[PDB]
C-alpha cells in the first residue's frame, strides 16, 4: 500500500532525524516561525506595541544591534484578538501592528509542543522508558507562561515577552514593578532550581571526572579512556561516593547511580515547573508578598525594612513603564 510506505517512512528509526507524526506538525510550524523570525529581526519596520501610535523599532536595518533587536509584540489595540496576515488590509498595516509576533509565537508554541511529543514518540520507537519529554515540559511550560498564559491573564499579547535580548529584560523589569516576583515563593523556587541545578550539574561532573579510572597516559586526553559502547563503567562510583560522603557525611551522599540521576532530573524540573507556574499565576494578578509598611513603631511611625526599599525601586519602574499609555491613576492593565 502507498499509505503504508509513507507511514513506514514517517515512523522510521533509520532516518538521520526522526520525523514521526508529531514531526509532521513540528517541521512546518517551526520552519515557518524560524523563517519569519529571521526576516523580522533583520528587516521589520517599527511596531506600535503599546497601541498609542508611538512605534518601537526592533530590527537590525532600523538601527538595532544583536542586543537591542527584537521582534516586537503585537499592538495593545489588538489585545487578545487573533491577527493573522489575511485579517489585515495590507502587509504594511500588518507590520505596523505587530503581525509577525503572533505568527511566530503561535507557530513556535505549536512546534515546541510537538517537539515534546516527538520526544515521547522516538523514545517509544527505540524501546526506551518514556519520561524525557516530561523534563522538557519544564522549559516548554515556561515558554507557554511568557508568550501565551501571561498575555491571556493580562488581556493582550502586547505584554508577551519580546523576542529579543533587551526586550526580555524589559519584560523582567516591568514584571517586577507590577507583580513583585522576587518576593514570590514560586520564582524563589525557580532560583533554587536553576542555581541548584547549576550546582548539582557542577557537582556531578566534577565527581565523575574525579573518579575516572586510569586508562590513558599523560600525553593524551583522559577522554580517550572511554570507547562508545563499552560495557564497563568508566568511573568508580564507590570511590566517588567514598570521597563525597566524607566531604559532608556518608548518608548525605548517593551510592545509587539511578537514585542520583533521578535527583539530577527532579531538582531543576520541579523548580522550573514552579517558576512557570509563578508567571502563570501572576498572570491572574496573584502577586508576590507585599510587606510594605509592615513594621510600625509604638507611636505609629513606619519603620522601613528591606521590603520598603524594594518598593521604592518597584515604584520607580512603575511610574516609568509605558510612560504615555496611562490616563487614569491605577495600573489595571
Amino acid at each position: 500500500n502507498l499509505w503504508e510506505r509513507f507511514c513506514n517512512w514517517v515512523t522510521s528509526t533509520d532516518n538521520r532525524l526522526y520525523v514521526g507524526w508529531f514531526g509532521v506538525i513540528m517541521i512546518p510550524t517551526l520552519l515557518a516561525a524560524t523563517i519569519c523570525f529571521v526576516i523580522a529581526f533583520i528587516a521589520a519596520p517599527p511596531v506600535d506595541i503599546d497601541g498609542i501610535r508611538e512605534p518601537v523599532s526592533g530590527s537590525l536595518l532600523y538601527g538595532n544591534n544583536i542586543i537591542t533587536g527584537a521582534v516586537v509584540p503585537s499592538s495593545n489595540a489588538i489585545g487578545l484578538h487573533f491577527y493573522p496576515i489575511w485579517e489585515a488590509a495590507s502587509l504594511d498595516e500588518w507590520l505596523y501592528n505587530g503581525g509577525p509576533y503572533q505568527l511566530i509565537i503561535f507557530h513556535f508554541l505549536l512546534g515546541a509542543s510537538c517537539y515534546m511529543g516527538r520526544q515521547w514518540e522516538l523514545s517509544y520507537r527505540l524501546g526506551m522508558r518514556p519520561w524525557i519529554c516530561v523534563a522538557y515540559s519544564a522549559p516548554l511550560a515556561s515558554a507557554f507562561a511568557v508568550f501565551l498564559i501571561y498575555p491571556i491573564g493580562q488581556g493582550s499579547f502586547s505584554d508577551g515577552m519580546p523576542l529579543g535580548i533587551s526586550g526580555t529584560f524589559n519584560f523582567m523589569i516591568v514584571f517586577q514593578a507590577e507583580h513583585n516576583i522576587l518576593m514570590h515563593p514560586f520564582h524563589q523556587l525557580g532560583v533554587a532550581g536553576v542555581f541548584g541545578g547549576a550546582l548539582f550539574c557542577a557537582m556531578h561532573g566534577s565527581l565523575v571526572t574525579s573518579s575516572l579510572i586510569r586508562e590513558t597516559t599523560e600525553t593524551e586526553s583522559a577522554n580517550y579512556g572511554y570507547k562508545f559502547g563499552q560495557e564497563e563503567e568508566t568511573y568508580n562510583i564507590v570511590a566517588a561516593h567514598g570521597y563525597f560522603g566524607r566531604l559532608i557525611f556518608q548518608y548525605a551522599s548517593f551510592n545509587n547511580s539511578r537514585s542520583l540521576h533521578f535527583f539530577l532530573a527532579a531538582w531543576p524540573v520541579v523548580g522550573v515547573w514552579f517558576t512557570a507556574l509563578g508567571i502563570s499565576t501572576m498572570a491572574f494578578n496573584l502577586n508576590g508578598f507585599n510587606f510594605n509598611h509592615s513594621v510600625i513603631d509604638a507611636k505609629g511611625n513606619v519603620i522601613n525594612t528591606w521590603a520598603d526599599i524594594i518598593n521604592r525601586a518597584n515604584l520607580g519602574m512603575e511610574v516609568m513603564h509605558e510612560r504615555n499609555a496611562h490616563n487614569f491613576p491605577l495600573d489595571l492593565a
Binding site: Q250, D297, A298, K299, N301, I303
Partner: protein, 81 residues
C-alpha cells in the same frame, strides 16, 4: 560501612535519651523565651524597643555620620530619647 558512633536511630529511640532530653530541649527553649521576655535581648544587642526608634517629635533617622567617634555618636542618639 559504619564508622563507629552509635546510630542516631538507636539514640532517639533509647529511653535514656528522652529521660535526659525531655528536660534539656524544653530548658533551652524556656531559656530562649526568657531572653526575650525579660528584655535582655534588647540591651545585649542594642536593638531598639518599639518606643526607642525616635523621640516623640522626630522623623529624622539617627544615622552614623563619623567613623571614629561613632561609638559616642550612637550614645548621643540614645540620650535624646
Amino acid at each position: 560501612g559504619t564508622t563507629g558512633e552509635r546510630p542516631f536511630s538507636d539514640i532517639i529511640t533509647s529511653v535514656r535519651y528522652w529521660v535526659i532530653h525531655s528536660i534539656t530541649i524544653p530548658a533551652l527553649f524556656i531559656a530562649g523565651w526568657l531572653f526575650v521576655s525579660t528584655g535582655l535581648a534588647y540591651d545585649v544587642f542594642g536593638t531598639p524597643r518599639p518606643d526607642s526608634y525616635y523621640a516623640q517629635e522626630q522623623r529624622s533617622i539617627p544615622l552614623v555620620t563619623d567613623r571614629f567617634e561613632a561609638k559616642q555618636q550612637v550614645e548621643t542618639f540614645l540620650e535624646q530619647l
